[PDB]
Amino acid sequence: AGPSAPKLEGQMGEDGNSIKVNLIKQDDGGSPIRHYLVKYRALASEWKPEIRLPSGSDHVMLKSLDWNAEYEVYVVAENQQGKSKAAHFVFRTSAQ
Numbered sequence: 001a002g003p004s005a006p007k008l009e010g011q012m013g014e015d016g017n018s019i020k021v022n023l024i025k026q027d028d029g030g031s032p033i034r035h036y037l038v039k040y041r042a043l044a045s046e047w048k049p050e051i052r053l054p055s056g057s058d059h060v061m062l063k064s065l066d067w068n069a070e071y072e073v074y075v076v077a078e079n080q081q082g083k084s085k086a087a088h089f090v091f092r093t094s095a096q
Helices: none
Strands: 007-013 018-024 031-043 061-062 070-080 082-093
Touching: 018 031, 018 070, 031 061, 061 070
Parallel strands: none
Antiparallel strands: 007 018, 018 061, 031 070, 070 082
16 A cells, blocks of 8 residues: 555766656655655666655756666655555666
8 A cells, every 4th residue: 555656757967877866756645755765776786875865855866877887776655654666767878
């Protein structure tokens, strides 16, 4: 039970490996949502030191990743009355 997994919109910075993951909400039940659990990995190493967002954020970010590499970002959310499944955002970095 609980909210539905967030929708992750991808904004890539012209730096080549600067990634902003925007967390769009849709169904929670009056938005009783609490922060996000964000963990991501690349096509080289898995699960990097994950991060927990503030209690009610808008996005999560990662900077200075491997060039010409693929990345997987998994974002879970918490809610007053339980947890909300993980949504998966996938992208690739630019070339150095």
